């Protein structure tokens, strides 16, 4: 069903999940486990959690109306990371390098 633009998005998503960016992309593979990491305030601070597996799920299930809907979730993921964690945290540095990859790919979408 996917439109040409939403195919390009699935291409970007496929790249963000590859071994090429694993060094800084792995904390975003699955939802943030507030249990395991013992983050008792994560869901009180992050109202709308988001990760790459969820984005893949919605992409496979064709839940995105357009490319803008895709980008919104991907940025929501990064926004939550910036919002919850201190500015000096390594996971923030990881998010920034991965977002560099995303924004660069997304901007060059035909």
């Amino acid at each position: 069903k996917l439109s040409e633009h939403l195919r390009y998005c699935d291409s970007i998503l496929r790249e963000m999940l590859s071994k090429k960016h694993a060094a800084y992309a792995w904390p975003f593979y699955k939802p943030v486990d507030a249990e395991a990491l013992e983050l008792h305030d994560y869901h009180d601070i992050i109202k709308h959690p988001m990760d790459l597996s969820t984005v893949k799920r919605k992409m496979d299930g064709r839940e995105y109306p357009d490319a803008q809907g895709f980008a919104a979730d991907v940025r929501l993921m990064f926004s939550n990371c910036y919002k919850y964690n201190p500015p000096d945290h390594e996971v923030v540095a990881m998010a920034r390098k991965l977002q560099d990859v995303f924004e660069m790919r997304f901007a060059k979408m035909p």
Binding site: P27, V32, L37, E38, L39, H40, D41, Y42, Y84, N85, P86, H89, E90, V91
Partner: peptide
Amino acid sequence: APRKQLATK
């Protein structure tokens, strides 16, 4: 205040 720890277990 809770801080997420990426360090392996």
